[PDB]
Amino acid sequence: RFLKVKNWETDVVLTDTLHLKSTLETGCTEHICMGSIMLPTKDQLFPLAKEFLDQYYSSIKRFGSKAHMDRLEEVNKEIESTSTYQLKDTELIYGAKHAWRNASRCVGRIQWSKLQVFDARDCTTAHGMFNYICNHVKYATNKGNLRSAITIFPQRTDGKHDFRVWNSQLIRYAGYKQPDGSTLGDPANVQFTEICIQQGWKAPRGRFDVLPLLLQANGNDPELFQIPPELVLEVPIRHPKFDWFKDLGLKWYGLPAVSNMLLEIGGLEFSACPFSGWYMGTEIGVRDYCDNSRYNILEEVAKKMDLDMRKTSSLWKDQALVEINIAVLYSFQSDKVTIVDHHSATESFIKHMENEYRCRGGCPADWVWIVPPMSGSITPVFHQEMLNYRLTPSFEYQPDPWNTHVW
């Protein structure tokens, strides 16, 4: 019921007590570990509301004070009569920062408390949403000096009136199926790209076409909007020694902003809550460029480096993977767009884990996601035991809205 985690590179040993306040379920049993699976009422709402305010008031050292009990009565009162309730600003800010704090898949959490929260609960329309969104994109982009932010749309009510950003990220490239069999652009987005055109988008049909936003306000059909180009900071990708690299004509966007997750604070569900930080290099260079089901450029790059592709044992895919990632980090740096390499991002996360053990009694963490997808064991997180558990408030996955939405 108290647990040890050990780092096998440093023999440092940490004691987790924070898992005892774990709420949700992992997907694992004593018989079977699912640690590698990607996706593993008035009466319901009150316990949730309670548990949350208890967390809040304890954090500001007013646990069991007049103001505590009072707000607790107030929220019951509201639950009893409205069937939902509304968070104060301070609770909304706390709830969101804590949801990032509890995101066990997130290596970037040393930054958790500096989150800038934009309260968009007064929004009513997709045009409204589009405005909030551009203001978020501009504030977080900050001409390259990126800053954490989240924008929070109104919470669900009857689930017939949901706010949803249909895009999976605010800024992503289109995917088009082609006559020859293959795919132009980004294969991950192929289906959303069909939906845009099927909702009315004129697509330019290139390799790096910034998708339009598809926004659903208050349960209505969603609407199309094009993000002002001047707000999409993009980096052309070159290499500090390979001349011919720029002739692949690769570019990437500077602002990663996940837009399809659900935020749960004290039993309340915020289905549209786009958030953003900045990239660790490997995300683009290893996954976006090199996954077979993504841009998949390893073959071409190795072709230009004149490496021996005649057998796997020359490690040509590995040599190329390195140079590709050198060319992402260098390009972003040369243009001064915040970016972090996997080495210092992981070292920071170790520091963050230590802090969290010391001050909070633990730090939930999902090893499978924290260890970068190249050079794993030469980052310190590889040697670090982690405990994974689900704390609230949290970010949750939710089904792609087109599967749910009724027209």
Binding site partner of 288, from ligand H4B, ligand JM6, Zn ion, none, Cβ cut-off 5-8 A by kind: ligand JM6
What phi and psi, each to the nearest 5 degrees, are found at residue 173? Answer: -90, 145
Site size for ligand HEM, by CB under 6 A? Answer: 21
Provide the mask over 328-347, with x wherever binding to ligand HEM is found by CB under 6 A and - wherever it is not: ------------x----x--
Nearer to ligand JM6, 197 or 258 (CB): 258
By DSSP bridging, strand 149-152 and strand 116-119 are parallel
Q: Are 5 and 387 in contact (CB under 8 A)?
A: yes
Q: Taking CB under 6 A as the criterion, which residues in 17-36 touch ligand H4B? A: 36
Q: Which of 316, 314, 308, 311 is nearest to 290 (CA)?
A: 316
Q: Is 109 a catalytic residue?
A: yes
Which residues partner with 184 through β-bridges? Answer: 176
Spatial separation of the C-alpha atoms in residues 67 and 371, rounded to whole Å: 43
**Catalytic residue from among 71, 106, 196, 323:** 106
Beta strand spans in 124-168 (E) = 149-152, 164-165
Q: Which residues are annotated as a binding site?
A: 36, 106, 169, 278-279, 283, 368-369, 382, 397
Q: Which of 343, 370, 390, 319 is nearest to 107 (CA)?
A: 370
Which residues partner with 262 through β-bridges? Answer: 396
Classify residue 338 by burial, with Cβ atoms within 10 Å: 0-12, 13-18, 19+. middle
In whole angstroms, how close is the CB of 73 to ligand HEM at the nearest point? Answer: 31
Could you tell me if residue 361 is left (phi over 0), alpha (psi between -120 and 50 degrees) or otherwise beta?
Answer: left
Binding site partner of 312, from a copy of itself, ligand HEM, ligand H4B, none, Cβ cut-off 5-8 A by kind: a copy of itself
Order of strands across the sheet that contains 262-265: 268-270, 262-265, 394-396
In whole angstroms, how close is the CB of 34 to Zn ion at the nearest point? Answer: 6
**Catalytic residue from among 71, 91, 100, 109:** 109
Q: Taking CB under 5 A as the criterion, which residues in 30-89 touch Zn ion? A: 33, 35
Considering the rule CB under 8 A, would residue 61 count as an interface residue with a copy of itself?
Answer: no
Q: Is 106 a catalytic residue?
A: yes
Q: Is 294 a catalytic residue?
A: no
Binding site partner of 8, from Zn ion, ligand H4B, ligand HEM, none, Cβ cut-off 5-8 A by kind: ligand H4B
**Catalytic residue from among 264, 283, 323, 356:** 283
In whole angstroms, how close is the CB of 25 to ligand HEM at the nearest point? Answer: 17
Binding site partner of 171, from ligand HEM, a copy of itself, ligand H4B, none, Cβ cut-off 5-8 A by kind: none
Q: Per-residue DSSP letters for 160-205? A: SS--EE-SSBSS-B-EEE-TTSSEEE-GGGHHHHHHHHHHT-----
Q: Which of 123, 101, 121 is nearest to 113 (CA)?
A: 101
Q: Are 253 and 233 in contact (CB under 8 A)?
A: yes
Considering the rule CB under 5 A, would residue 3 count as an interface residue with Zn ion?
Answer: no
Site size for ligand JM6, by CB under 6 A? Answer: 15
Q: Residue 161 is encoded by which pair of tokens? A: 């009136």
Q: Are 166 and 401 in contact (CB under 8 A)?
A: yes
Of 95, 175, 222, 256, the one binding ligand JM6 by CB under 6 A = 256
The window from 235-243, 280-288, 306-314, 331-339 that contacts ligand JM6 (CB under 6 A) reads 280-288
Provide the mask over 366-385, with x wherever binding to ligand H4B is found by CB under 6 A and - wherever it is not: --xx------------xxxx
Q: Are 330 and 341 in contact (CB under 8 A)?
A: no
Q: Is 166 a catalytic residue?
A: no
Spatial separation of the C-alpha atoms in residues 286 and 176, rounded to whole Å: 22
Considering the rule CB under 6 A, would residue 39 count as an interface residue with ligand H4B?
Answer: no
Residues that bind ligand HEM (CB under 6 A): 100, 103, 105-108, 111, 115, 148, 150, 258, 261, 275, 277-278, 280, 283, 340, 345, 369, 395
Binding site for a copy of itself (CB under 8 A): 3, 5-6, 8-9, 19, 22, 25-38, 281, 286-287, 290-293, 298, 312-315, 317-319, 321-322, 325-326, 329, 333, 341, 343-344, 366-368, 371-378, 382-383, 385-389
Catalytic residues: 106, 109, 278, 283
